[PDB]
């Protein structure tokens, strides 16, 4: 007897089902835990050990308990991946694994008064950094572009356009350009509980710079759903952090000057008048790389736009072959 | 005896500093030519 085999096999041919159906809003696994140890996930869900990095997408709205993932790769292996609410629940049960951990005074507590953990050390707390473990995002994580300079300054104005230049005529259909200029330096995952919605109650938020800098992802959805990344240049995209954990997780390409010596040697390209940025230009490198940057996977670094072309193009093309 | 002072390094660092300038400039030069 197998009543599940009539359903799970139906479920298995329901998970991907028609395959060609476009996958929906992404659901990114971030907590690493064994997915093979305990057999679960409705369809028996034999997915590999969970981890961060892997950018999965959910479209099967069967049950809230476990979701479906789409890791960035050709084929997009489909497995019953835990929900954002349930992933922090599967990590919960292991809190008492090591000798009834928590408030209990477990030290030689075998006799008379005993101490089990009450419902106080679990996820009932930690509201300040209360963030959903899964990151809902969209299509082909756009790649962000950062080099040591001030955006909108001599060396940038000409060169910062040439970073895509070829990509406009080379990388299209798969990729598109939506040039925007805003200040994405206020929210990363969830900070403000009263976001932009009314400018009539004399709120200090509306008096500040909210709304347009808030709903960047909301309006870019129309292009993000188009399976195409975002190319933008503004006055805030200058360094790691903030954008390193903002509403869109970043793939960073480094337009670096390599040696600081040629930073100042290039900084006077046409004569002089660095007066807009001279000091902040030398620390423009120092504000991002002296401390371990732990970013810039694709270092667009060479004395060639043509070799930096292949350095930039090779990664994106393979990374974009995945969604095929 | 004279290589220990590092005099070869200065010329060694001079070539790369000169080599990584022309491609930096012409990239900047042709970028202006593509027009906004």
């Amino acid at each position: 007897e197998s009543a599940r085999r009539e359903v799970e096999s139906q479920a298995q041919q329901q998970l991907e089902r028609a395959k060609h159906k476009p996958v929906a809003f992404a659901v990114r696994t971030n907590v690493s835990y064994c997915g093979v140890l305990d057999e679960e996930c409705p369809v028996q869900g034999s997915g590999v050990n969970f981890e961060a990095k892997d950018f999965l997408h959910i479209k099967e709205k069967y049950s809230n308990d476990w979701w479906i993932g789409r890791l960035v790769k050709e084929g997009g292996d489909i497995a019953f991946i835990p929900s954002p609410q349930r992933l922090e629940s599967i990590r919960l049960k292991q809190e008492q694994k090591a000798r009834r951990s928590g408030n209990p005074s477990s030290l030689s507590d075998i006799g008379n008064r005993r101490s089990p953990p009450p419902s106080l050390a679990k996820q009932k707390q930690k509201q300040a950094e209360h963030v959903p473990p899964y990151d809902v995002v969209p299509s082909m994580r756009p790649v962000v572009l950062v080099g040591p300079s001030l955006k909108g300054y001599e060396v940038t104005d000409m060169m910062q356009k040439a970073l895509f230049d070829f990509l406009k005529h080379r990388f299209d259909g798969r990729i598109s350009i939506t040039r925007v200029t805003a200040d994405l330096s206020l929210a990363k995952r969830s900070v403000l509980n009263n976001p932009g919605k009314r400018t009539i109650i004399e709120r200090s938020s509306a008096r500040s710079s909210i709304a347009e800098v808030q709903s960047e992802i909301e309006r870019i959805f129309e292009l993000a759903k188009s399976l195409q990344l975002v190319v933008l240049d503004a006055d805030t995209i200058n360094h790691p952090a903030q954008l390193a954990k903002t509403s869109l997780a970043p793939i960073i390409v480094f337009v670096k000057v390599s040696s600081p010596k040629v930073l100042q040697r290039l900084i006077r390209s046409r004569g002089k008048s660095q007066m807009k940025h001279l000091t902040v230009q030398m620390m423009a490198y120092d504000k991002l790389v002296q401390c371990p940057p732990e970013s810039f996977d694709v270092i667009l670094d060479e004395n060639q736009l043509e070799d930096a072309c292949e350095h930039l193009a090779e990664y994106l093309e393979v990374y974009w072959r995945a969604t095929h | 005896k004279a290589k220990a002072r590092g005099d070869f390094q200065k010329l060694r660092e001079k070539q790369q500093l000169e080599e990584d300038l022309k491609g930096y400039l012409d990239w900047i030069t042709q970028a202006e030519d593509i027009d906004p």
């Binding site: 090779e314 990664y315 393979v318 | 070869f8 010329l11 060694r12 070539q15």
Partner: peptide, 26 residues
């Protein structure tokens, strides 16, 4: 000086270029 400069500068040519696969083949 020229011979040593060549043998010490063109040597890194391989270790820099050929690592094009190092980021990818990994």
């Amino acid at each position: 000086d020229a011979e040593s400069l060549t043998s010490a500068q063109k040597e890194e040519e391989e270790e820099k270029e050929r690592k094009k696969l190092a980021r990818t083949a990994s």
